[PDB]
Design a protein around this motif. Structure first.
Motif, PDB file in Angstrom:
ATOM      1  N   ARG A 151      19.007  23.993  23.540  1.00 54.93           N
ATOM      2  CA  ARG A 151      19.577  23.241  22.433  1.00 54.93           C
ATOM      3  C   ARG A 151      18.527  23.137  21.339  1.00 54.93           C
ATOM      4  NH1 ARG A 151      19.945  20.580  26.811  1.00 54.93           N
ATOM      5  NH2 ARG A 151      22.174  20.198  26.440  1.00 54.93           N
ATOM      6  N   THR A 153      17.163  20.760  19.881  1.00 55.98           N
ATOM      7  CA  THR A 153      16.331  19.567  19.930  1.00 55.98           C
ATOM      8  C   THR A 153      15.181  19.690  20.920  1.00 55.98           C
ATOM      9  OG1 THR A 153      17.707  18.479  21.605  1.00 55.98           O
ATOM     10  CG2 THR A 153      18.339  18.201  19.295  1.00 55.98           C
TER      11      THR A 153
ATOM     12  N   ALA D  45      30.912   9.832   3.442  1.00 53.57           N
ATOM     13  CA  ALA D  45      30.009  10.868   3.908  1.00 53.57           C
ATOM     14  C   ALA D  45      30.803  11.964   4.612  1.00 53.57           C
ATOM     15  CB  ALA D  45      28.951  10.286   4.848  1.00 53.57           C
ATOM     16  N   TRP D  48      31.657  16.323  10.967  1.00 55.10           N
ATOM     17  CA  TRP D  48      31.919  17.586  11.637  1.00 55.10           C
ATOM     18  C   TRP D  48      33.340  17.652  12.193  1.00 55.10           C
ATOM     19  CZ3 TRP D  48      30.708  19.324  17.132  1.00 55.10           C
ATOM     20  CH2 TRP D  48      30.728  20.716  17.220  1.00 55.10           C
ATOM     21  N   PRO D  62      32.744  15.442  19.731  1.00 53.25           N
ATOM     22  CA  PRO D  62      33.021  14.666  20.956  1.00 53.25           C
ATOM     23  C   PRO D  62      34.162  13.680  20.789  1.00 53.25           C
ATOM     24  CG  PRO D  62      30.661  14.782  20.525  1.00 53.25           C
ATOM     25  CD  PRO D  62      31.342  15.321  19.302  1.00 53.25           C
ATOM     26  N   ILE D 104      21.303  24.844   8.667  1.00 53.50           N
ATOM     27  CA  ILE D 104      22.627  24.301   8.962  1.00 53.50           C
ATOM     28  C   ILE D 104      23.474  24.262   7.694  1.00 53.50           C
ATOM     29  CG2 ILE D 104      23.879  22.476  10.142  1.00 53.50           C
ATOM     30  CD1 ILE D 104      20.150  22.259  10.290  1.00 53.50           C
TER      31      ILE D 104
ATOM     32  N   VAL E  28      16.588  11.022  19.568  1.00 51.93           N
ATOM     33  CA  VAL E  28      17.266  11.985  18.710  1.00 51.93           C
ATOM     34  C   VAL E  28      16.604  13.329  19.010  1.00 51.93           C
ATOM     35  CG1 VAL E  28      17.773  12.619  16.279  1.00 51.93           C
ATOM     36  CG2 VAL E  28      17.868  10.225  17.022  1.00 51.93           C
ATOM     37  N   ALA E  30      13.251  15.842  19.338  1.00 51.66           N
ATOM     38  CA  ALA E  30      11.963  16.070  18.699  1.00 51.66           C
ATOM     39  C   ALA E  30      11.978  15.789  17.203  1.00 51.66           C
ATOM     40  CB  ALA E  30      11.497  17.508  18.941  1.00 51.66           C
ATOM     41  N   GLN E  32      12.852  17.588  14.480  1.00 49.68           N
ATOM     42  CA  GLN E  32      12.143  18.715  13.889  1.00 49.68           C
ATOM     43  C   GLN E  32      12.928  19.427  12.803  1.00 49.68           C
ATOM     44  OE1 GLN E  32      11.351  21.394  17.145  1.00 49.68           O
ATOM     45  NE2 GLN E  32      13.518  21.627  17.687  1.00 49.68           N
ATOM     46  N   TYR E  33      14.244  19.527  12.941  1.00 48.99           N
ATOM     47  CA  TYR E  33      15.104  20.142  11.937  1.00 48.99           C
ATOM     48  C   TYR E  33      15.808  19.027  11.174  1.00 48.99           C
ATOM     49  CZ  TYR E  33      14.314  24.203  14.889  1.00 48.99           C
ATOM     50  OH  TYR E  33      13.740  25.206  15.631  1.00 48.99           O
ATOM     51  N   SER E  35      17.812  18.621   7.478  1.00 50.07           N
ATOM     52  CA  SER E  35      18.321  19.214   6.253  1.00 50.07           C
ATOM     53  C   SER E  35      18.839  18.147   5.298  1.00 50.07           C
ATOM     54  CB  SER E  35      19.452  20.199   6.563  1.00 50.07           C
ATOM     55  OG  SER E  35      18.959  21.441   7.026  1.00 50.07           O
ATOM     56  N   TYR E  88      22.371  13.496   0.894  1.00 50.54           N
ATOM     57  CA  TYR E  88      22.636  13.204   2.295  1.00 50.54           C
ATOM     58  C   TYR E  88      21.639  13.959   3.156  1.00 50.54           C
ATOM     59  CZ  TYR E  88      27.181  11.637   0.523  1.00 50.54           C
ATOM     60  OH  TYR E  88      28.181  11.011  -0.187  1.00 50.54           O
ATOM     61  N   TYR E  92      20.899  17.329  13.969  1.00 52.71           N
ATOM     62  CA  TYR E  92      21.608  17.167  15.230  1.00 52.71           C
ATOM     63  C   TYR E  92      20.916  16.155  16.126  1.00 52.71           C
ATOM     64  CZ  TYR E  92      22.559  22.147  13.972  1.00 52.71           C
ATOM     65  OH  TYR E  92      22.847  23.321  13.319  1.00 52.71           O
ATOM     66  N   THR E  93      21.715  15.397  16.853  1.00 49.28           N
ATOM     67  CA  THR E  93      21.189  14.569  17.916  1.00 49.28           C
ATOM     68  C   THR E  93      21.470  15.322  19.216  1.00 49.28           C
ATOM     69  OG1 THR E  93      21.284  12.402  18.994  1.00 49.28           O
ATOM     70  CG2 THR E  93      23.306  13.194  17.984  1.00 49.28           C
ATOM     71  N   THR E  94      21.356  14.645  20.351  1.00 49.62           N
ATOM     72  CA  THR E  94      21.554  15.331  21.620  1.00 49.62           C
ATOM     73  C   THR E  94      22.987  15.827  21.786  1.00 49.62           C
ATOM     74  OG1 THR E  94      22.301  13.634  23.173  1.00 49.62           O
ATOM     75  CG2 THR E  94      20.014  13.493  22.378  1.00 49.62           C
ATOM     76  N   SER E  95      23.975  15.048  21.346  1.00 46.13           N
ATOM     77  CA  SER E  95      25.360  15.471  21.521  1.00 46.13           C
ATOM     78  C   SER E  95      26.024  16.143  20.323  1.00 46.13           C
ATOM     79  CB  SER E  95      26.213  14.259  21.907  1.00 46.13           C
ATOM     80  OG  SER E  95      26.668  13.579  20.751  1.00 46.13           O
ATOM     81  N   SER E  96      25.659  15.825  19.082  1.00 46.67           N
ATOM     82  CA  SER E  96      26.391  16.439  17.975  1.00 46.67           C
ATOM     83  C   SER E  96      25.661  16.223  16.658  1.00 46.67           C
ATOM     84  CB  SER E  96      27.818  15.885  17.866  1.00 46.67           C
ATOM     85  OG  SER E  96      28.629  16.747  17.090  1.00 46.67           O
ATOM     86  N   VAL E  97      25.873  17.157  15.727  1.00 43.46           N
ATOM     87  CA  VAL E  97      25.296  17.057  14.391  1.00 43.46           C
ATOM     88  C   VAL E  97      25.615  15.689  13.795  1.00 43.46           C
ATOM     89  CG1 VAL E  97      27.313  18.083  13.260  1.00 43.46           C
ATOM     90  CG2 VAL E  97      25.064  18.311  12.239  1.00 43.46           C
ATOM     91  N   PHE E  99      24.866  12.895  10.297  1.00 44.33           N
ATOM     92  CA  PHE E  99      24.606  12.775   8.871  1.00 44.33           C
ATOM     93  C   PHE E  99      24.013  11.407   8.538  1.00 44.33           C
ATOM     94  CE2 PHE E  99      26.315  16.435   6.576  1.00 44.33           C
ATOM     95  CZ  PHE E  99      27.009  17.084   7.582  1.00 44.33           C
ATOM     96  N   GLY E 100      23.499  11.305   7.302  1.00 44.97           N
ATOM     97  CA  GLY E 100      22.989  10.056   6.779  1.00 44.97           C
ATOM     98  C   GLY E 100      24.087   9.249   6.096  1.00 44.97           C
ATOM     99  N   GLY E 101      23.822   7.957   5.879  1.00 43.40           N
ATOM    100  CA  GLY E 101      24.803   7.099   5.227  1.00 43.40           C
ATOM    101  C   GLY E 101      25.073   7.376   3.761  1.00 43.40           C
TER     102      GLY E 101
END
Lengths: 248, 108, 118, 118, 108
Positions: A151, A153, D45, D48, D62, D104, E28, E30, E32-33, E35, E88, E92-97, E99-101
């Protein structure tokens, strides 16, 4: 391919240039045993094998002569007299999906070590000491294969890495894989040192008038004096005369 | 003082585990003969491997030794509940045979 | 191969302790074969004591030498270890193991627990 | 690279909404390349919807999975997203952007505003 | 809740400003990515920078990212009147991309 399904291949009968590598990538892991990478393009080899697969991040160190571990001791182990080298370049732009890519596996459990270059595919259910839990769950009923599940992450230690291992042979080798690639513009009518496909000599070159049969490459006068030669590039017949000499 | 072994190890049943027997002493020689013994709960120690990667016929096929320089990495594959025991290493120095401080392996 | 130790199980301070280890399957006449002694305090690690080669060249531990004169008898294939001056430290198990040069102490016996106290 | 969305502009409550995103310049055969969907309520906002990898490994959101069966056709380079049971929350703009692993949503389309009401 | 973005900002034209979109949530990964996207007044967002210290070829030379720990400080130097827009962040987090508020930038 996966670690336990490496893609063995042989690459022979070719003018082999080991410098197409350097324009490829940053080459994260590149260290050679028995031969320097700089002086590779010249040397010749018997049979060159190439094995390609993908592993995790902190296990790239385990592909080395005599190093014990979990990928080295269970599904891919190379000998101590290895000659060749390994090339690994971190690749997580084409291998990791969001959520975990359960497409690459690796034998995690087994009974003993494997012999050099011994690849196995059997996927039976591991024992449980007594007559096990075949195809069911229980105390230690662990499938032998385990997916990587990449993944975007994961830390740099858990990122996918593509890796190729080249196994050479150098002892008494019938040169099958090596490149010369070195020619020079032809010079005529001047005393010149020539090396035509191995025939080395000195003399003045002149346009020929004799008909070599198409399978012939050298020409001789009486007493084995090499009188003519055909060019391996333009196929023109050339006459050789030793340049002028005498006593004074 | 003569050799050195870690306190204890506990490996989950069905996994592998390695133990180190660092010499931690200068001039133990070439460090070539290194035997390993299995100490039961109040029984006579049994030879597991001698001559590092070699092994005496009569014991299992999971133990395998190695030497990273000055130590002997005794390995145990396919951990079974039977392996809960003490382990010792043994190898002559210039004047005399020395032993390890002992290690305990409990499977859970 | 088989070994068996014997001797006094109980002993008092400053007494001469003797032990006899009888073996079977091999002797002390062939080359390479030797017999050594080892002790183990309760719940502690083993230790060396002495060694009697097949050529009758004998060796002792540096720290605990100048005593425990190890003798032998090749007629009945028996080895004898004798250590005088009992101390409360000497209460431990004792083993007589067969030594080859590479396979150091590959054949141990049973071991007999002996006590040194009033 | 280019993308263009199309489909019905109007839909009724509890209806099956369909959208077709046609792209040009790239395909779904090379590695790493994927295509995802995103929605945006008015003045809110983005969010997905789904993702279609190049190997035909599919992913959904999900919270809202078990719906929007996203299909595709690699001959004419076209993606189809279909989500049934329209609710007034789903009245928002919709974009189909091509997804790479690090960059992305680097190529977005135009986006079509769709309403769910009488 | 997943990310956090300020309500809006209004910077005078020609200066620099940095904005933070802290996650304020454990694991969340590492982180690291990260955008950033440009939301126009009613248009499809355009990627401005990804891999925070990196930047995609095709955009200006004033934007530059940084990471002060758990957030991504998107910076904007030499603010021009053209820059009035929404911004914005996305990672991605562990389960899904996620976004910011959202953030609003009006230049005055």
């Amino acid at each position: 391919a996966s670690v336990y399904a490496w893609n063995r291949k042989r690459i022979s009968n070719c003018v082999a240039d080991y410098s197409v590598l350097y324009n490829f990538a940053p080459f994260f892991a590149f260290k050679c045993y028995g031969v320097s990478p700089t002086k590779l393009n010249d040397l010749c080899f018997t049979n060159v094998y190439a094995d390609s697969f993908v592993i995790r991040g902190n296990e790239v160190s385990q592909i080395a002569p005599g190093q014990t571990g979990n990928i080295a001791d269970y599904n891919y182990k190379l000998p101590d007299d290895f000659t060749g080298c390994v090339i690994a370049w971190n690749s997580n732009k084409l291998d990791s999906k969001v959520g975990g890519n359960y497409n690459y596996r690796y034998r995690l459990f087994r009974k003993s070590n494997l012999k050099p270059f011994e690849r196995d595919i059997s996927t039976e259910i591991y024992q449980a000491g007594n007559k096990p839990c075949n195809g069911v769950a229980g105390v230690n009923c662990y499938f032998p294969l385990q997916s990587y599940g990449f993944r975007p992450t994961y830390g740099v230690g858990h990122q996918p890495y593509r890796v190729v291992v080249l196994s050479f042979e150098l002892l008494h080798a019938p040169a099958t894989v090596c490149g010369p690639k070195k020619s020079t513009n032809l010079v005529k009518n001047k005393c010149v040192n020539f090396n035509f496909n191995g025939l080395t000599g000195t003399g003045v070159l002149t346009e020929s008038n004799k008909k070599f049969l198409p399978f012939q490459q050298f020409g001789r006068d009486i007493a084995d004096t090499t009188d003519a030669v055909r060019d391996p590039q333009t196929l023109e017949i050339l006459d050789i005369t030793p340049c002028s000499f005498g006593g004074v | 003082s003569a050799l050195t072994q870690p306190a204890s190890v506990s490996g989950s049943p069905g996994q592998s585990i390695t133990i180190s027997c660092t010499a931690t002493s200068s001039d133990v020689g070439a460090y070539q003969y290194v035997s390993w013994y299995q100490q039961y709960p109040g029984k006579a120690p049994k030879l597991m491997i001698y001559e590092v990667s070699k092994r005496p016929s009569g014991v299992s096929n999971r133990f395998s030794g190695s030497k990273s320089g000055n130590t002997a990495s005794l390995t145990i594959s396919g951990l079974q509940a039977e392996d809960d025991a003490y382990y010792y290493c043994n190898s002559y120095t210039t004047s005399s045979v020395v032993f390890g401080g002992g290690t305990k392996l409990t499977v859970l | 191969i088989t070994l068996k130790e014997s001797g006094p199980t109980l002993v008092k301070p400053t007494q001469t302790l003797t032990l006899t280890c009888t073996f079977s399957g091999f002797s002390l006449s062939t080359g390479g074969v030797s017999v050594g002694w080892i002790r183990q305090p309760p719940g502690k690690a083993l230790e060396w004591l002495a060694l009697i080669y097949w050529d009758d060249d004998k060796r002792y531990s540096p720290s605990l030498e100048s005593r425990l004169t190890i003798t032998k008898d090749t007629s009945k294939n028996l080895v004898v270890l004798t250590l005088t001056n009992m101390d409360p430290v000497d209460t431990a198990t004792y083993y007589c193991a067969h030594k080859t040069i590479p396979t150091i102490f590959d054949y141990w016996g049973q071991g007999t627990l002996v006590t040194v106290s009033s």
